Design a binder for this molecule. Structure first.
Ligand SMILES: Nc1ncnc2c1ncn2[C@@H]1O[C@H](C[C@@H](N)CC[C@H](N)C(=O)O)[C@@H](O)[C@H]1O
Ligand SMILES: [Zn+2]
Ligand SMILES: [Zn+2]
Ligand SMILES: [Zn+2]
Length: 227
């Protein structure tokens, strides 16, 4: 299968030409952060010393109060630049490639070994209210779309990556997945990202459990249909 790197999506003209010859997926509008279709209405970690930073100690690691609350730190974190709990904000994504699968369309694969319980990518898109979601559901069905790109975020917010999003929109479903979603608060706004739940070796497809298309995940426990 052909593959491509995330940076290949930054050049719209080369992409559209790659897409014409099947070497990249269909064009979509690449975004860095969620766009609201309709606009809506500090931890206790001790600052690491310069010595500790040099020693390789982690700032705002597993014991960070904000991290436990699933809240990212701000620029005002006691650890400032060294804070490791600003992953969404700093786009500290995993090394992933977009690949053409045998029967699912395009997907995502690990380009390096990915440790367990690490951030992969944020699921970005157009954030829809209930009314917008209703309309998009109807439109996509009218247009006979094969692939769907919806992800519930919170009450009255559903992310739609069909038209605008990032490479997260390519992560396929598996009944025995190696990633999960987590909803994180950044500056009082909720976002959602993919995180590994296992060590994913280099070359392996990244998958999550979506929640009537037959399922081609290939798992021994396959539930047979996407759900
Ligand atoms: N396990 C699977 N078995 C079959 N089709 C799948 C599976 N996982 C994802 N898909 C397909 O991919 C869509 C979900 C997309 N967000 C994933 C990217 C999509 N594969 C693409 O080529 O753009 C679904 O609506 C299905 O059409
Ligand atoms: Zn902290
Ligand atoms: Zn912090
Ligand atoms: Zn399955």
């Amino acid at each position: 299968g052909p593959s491509c790197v995330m940076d290949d999506f930054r050049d719209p003209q080369r992409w559209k030409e790659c897409a014409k010859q099947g070497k990249m997926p269909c064009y979509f509008d690449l975004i860095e952060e969620n766009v609201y279709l309709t606009e809506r209405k500090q931890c206790e970690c001790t600052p690491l010393s310069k010595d500790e930073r040099a020693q390789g100690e982690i700032a705002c690691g597993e014991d960070c109060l904000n991290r436990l609350l699933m809240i990212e730190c701000s620029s005002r974190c006691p650890n400032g630049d060294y804070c490791s709990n600003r992953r969404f904000q700093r786009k500290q994504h995993a090394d992933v490639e977009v690949i053409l699968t045998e029967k699912k369309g395009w997907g995502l694969r690990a380009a390096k070994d990915l440790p367990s319980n690490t951030f992969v990518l944020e699921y970005c898109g157009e954030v829809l209210d209930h009314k917008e979601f209703k309309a998009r559901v109807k439109e996509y069905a009218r247009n006979k779309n094969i692939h769907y790109y919806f992800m519930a975020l919170k009450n009255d917010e559903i992310i739609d990556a069909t038209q605008k999003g990032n490479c997260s929109r390519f992560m396929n479903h598996s009944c025995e997945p190696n990633c999960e979603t987590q909803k994180w608060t950044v500056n009082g706004q909720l976002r959602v990202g993919f995180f590994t739940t296992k060590l994913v070796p280099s070359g392996s497809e990244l998958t999550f459990d979506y929640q009537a298309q037959k399922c081609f995940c290939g798992s021994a426990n396959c539930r047979g249909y996407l759900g």
